[PDB]
Design a binder for this molecule. Structure first.
Ligand SMILES: [Zn+2]
Ligand SMILES: [Zn+2]
Ligand SMILES: [Zn+2]
Ligand SMILES: [Zn+2]
Ligand SMILES: [Zn+2]
Length: 100
């Protein structure tokens, strides 16, 4: 499952719903794999077709850097992610948000 704090999940959950609610978002990486260290980032795949609009991207990075989370949120763009890498993410992930 997702090794983050309750309070941290809701912070993430709020930011995603206000800035990219038309996007499905998956957590992957060491935090879904039980191997999380204190300052491990949180890897999030932003799922869509076409590369995330720059502006909404910026605003996401802004919102996460402004928040109280004690580690970094590492955004991955599914649309420009290669198939080999997509296949590895699909082995193990946690859904955070689906497109409404
Ligand atoms: Zn990571
Ligand atoms: Zn990584
Ligand atoms: Zn990372
Ligand atoms: Zn990255
Ligand atoms: Zn494939």
């Amino acid at each position: 499952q997702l090794d983050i704090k309750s309070e941290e999940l809701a912070i993430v959950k709020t930011i995603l719903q206000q800035l990219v609610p038309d996007y499905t978002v998956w957590a992957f990486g060491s935090r879904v794999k039980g191997k999380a260290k204190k300052y491990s980032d949180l890897d999030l795949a932003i799922i869509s077709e076409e590369p995330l609009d720059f502006l909404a991207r910026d605003r996401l990075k802004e919102a996460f850097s402004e928040s109280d989370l004690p580690w970094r949120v590492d955004l991955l763009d599914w649309a420009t992610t290669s198939e080999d890498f997509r296949e590895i993410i699909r082995k193990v992930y946690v859904v955070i948000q689906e497109k409404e």
